[model samples]
Target: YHLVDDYGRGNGFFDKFNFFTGDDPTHGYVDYVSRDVAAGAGLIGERDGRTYMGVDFTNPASGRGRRSVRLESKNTYEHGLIVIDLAHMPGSVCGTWPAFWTLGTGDWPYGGAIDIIEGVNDNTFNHMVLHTSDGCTIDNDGFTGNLKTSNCYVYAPGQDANAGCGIEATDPNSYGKGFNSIGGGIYATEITPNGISIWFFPRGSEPGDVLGDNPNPANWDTPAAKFAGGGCDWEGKFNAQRLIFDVTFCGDWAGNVWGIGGCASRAANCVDFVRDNPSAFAESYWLVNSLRVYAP
Candidate 1:
């Protein structure tokens, strides 16, 4: 698919073409597409550089109620590494929820899903989580996943994590700010007996810039790193997973609560907005880029 539309020539090669919202009329926020200006809201096409896609919350003013978009990959379980490079997003609105994640090729709760890049409001904070079945669900320590300390460890036991661990970073002025100013680059969730190792490299971060050194796994440990400690037995359900990088509009998380104005002023106000936008939710999410998985 074509990267930049040739002034609406309608000849830009792509599997399809979706919404079209011109640049932002306001601040530095660069508006790419709008639901009111184009055809659809789900993935438009795939060509040249990578698979080109985007989603416009059908009802941005409301939230994500019955909205969802399923992405089918041409391949299967890859062992090496999975890479996803996203544009500098400005964070979800009060009541809107967006996610860059992966799902398994199989059934629900059985075929694991990994949430690598995801944020709810403007709290300037985000998290990494593994969604699986009933057997592997336990907190490491903090609200996210403690990973280090007593949360989880490698070779500890079937239940107790004594050695393996996980790592989460708390960075500022990163991810969801000005376009490109805030880098939402490479994020990896390495699964092992130790648990699931989570690492991130923002736009301006040192050592590894865009994607970490290819074929080098150790390069992922930075800002933070350790064995996965949280009792998230990912290998069990998520061994063979598929990638789904869609942007969901006001649903239960972002729209129904914190998406309004990006949690700027009153937290209560954001929450109230989500309550009101429940019925105004969109049906599908936005998928910005392609998701590739590598095998061992």
Candidate 2:
């Protein structure tokens, strides 16, 4: 694959993404801000050769919720490859739910959703998963991660609600505090007729073709996660998915699992901690170096 779209460290690096200021569907404790508000508040900008999108770290904590940025790409993709080089990401701050993923248009499961990088509160490893209609499931043989669930159906009976077909990374440095400690890295995802595959190469270990003018997923190592097999339909289940990056607080996922994590010792609950601790979120932000798309 050759370079088809270059969204590098220029001023226009994040220009293609639109700010989503609506209420978070997952009920995250965030007040999504508009582009103008984000710019004025220093919540979004490009600096030191990287694009930074972060939440309000300086303001007094509020029960109303913290101010943050949620960006969705104006463009959509079907079958192709995407590589994003990162310098940093929202870390393992308790009460924080950070994710860099993609979702198809319409009422969720009607299209599909893919979690390329996602974790909540003190999580040590990245989790990759897919959410789609019934009939979509995956086999775990082709990937290096541990399979947690197999049915991609949102309302599947046996699996927990919204669990999707998740695969947890074996690599400790693949997410959160561990990822930031290693100085971040690259995440490459390929959407093809065969399946959706993901690869994570830490800052010092990215492949030659990935950084070169052309990238071929076939030349890469076994993927971190692969969604296929179990008679799933790839092309039919996933459609024009829009890329997204966000850090929301104590919502469905984070709030639901609050006491199960170490955060219970810090506060009575998740939302209270997020509201009272203004400086704990200093590490919650995204510093993207470059993001590029490739086609056939």
Candidate 3:
């Protein structure tokens, strides 16, 4: 294995990651603040050797949006091992959608994208999904999670728009409020020429070797989700993907699934709830211990 990049304390994380201040493409009511604004608001900072990135919850807002921060890695990767040690992620709050994902440089789906950690409001379990152009599919193999869908095509007939292959973790402690309660965890994603696999380890159970110089995936037990052979070109559609982290409220997916957890009764719509309940999102944030990138 090759350790390409290691982002530990004292490293210029902000220098390597560019703050995304543009509009929320998913139509979420979020105002991605500029770097200066983020720093002033404490939306991005480091404390006690850990990096923190989260949304604004203390202040009241207008119909425009709530302040938040979105960070995208400056470097892109083709295939590598991405390990993220998070002390805490946004908890299960209504109208919230937090994610740690990767996407191509431009024109999504054609270049492929991977949703490593994504869940809607109050979703206890984590969802791992892939978005690719037509003619790609993932097979259910060598994973512990359940496959919700196999088609990786974004716009396939009868499939939801851009609904790619997805797998869901069974353990409630793997995401949302449950995850934070357990002190968060480590998420390791390995992408190779053969296939793409994702693994999750709770705080006390992560392999010790991972944090050291050398890491061996074989030592780890069954992964939470694995996507292997299914007549798809594993490398062709997925390349030059940059990592991203953000928390949005009442976005496309969260808003669509708002009815699942009785959130519909809370407000006339997702935006209304998010707009009126700023204090409710105080727990919406990300505390990262370390992030390292490795190649083999």
Best by lDDT: 2
TM-score of each: 0.58, 0.97, 0.96
Candidate 2, residue 96: how far the Cα is off, in Å: 0.6
Backbone atom clashes (below 3 Å) for every candidate: 45, 0, 0
Report the poorest 10 consecutive residues by lDDT, candidate 3. 7-16
Q: What's the CA RMSD for each of the models?
A: 10.0, 1.3, 1.4
On a 0 to 100 scale, what is the lDDT of residue 116 in model 2?
94
Tens digits of lDDT, candidate 3, 1-296: 56888876423777778889888988888888887898898788887888888888877766557888888999988888899999999888889999999997778778888999998888889999989999888887899999999988888678888778899998899998899999999999988887888999989899887776678887798999998895789888788788899998887788887877767788888887888788888888888898898888
TM-score of 2: 0.97
The candidates, ranked best first by lDDT, are: 2, 3, 1
Report the number of the highest-TM-score candidate. 2
lDDT of 1 by residue, 204-258 (tens): 4534532433435554344233333345554564566545444443334453444
Candidate 1 lDDT at 43 equals 33
- TM match of model 1 to true structure: 0.58
* Model 2 lowest lDDT segment of ten: 5-14
Q: What do the candidate models score in CA lDDT, each in turn?
A: 0.41, 0.87, 0.86
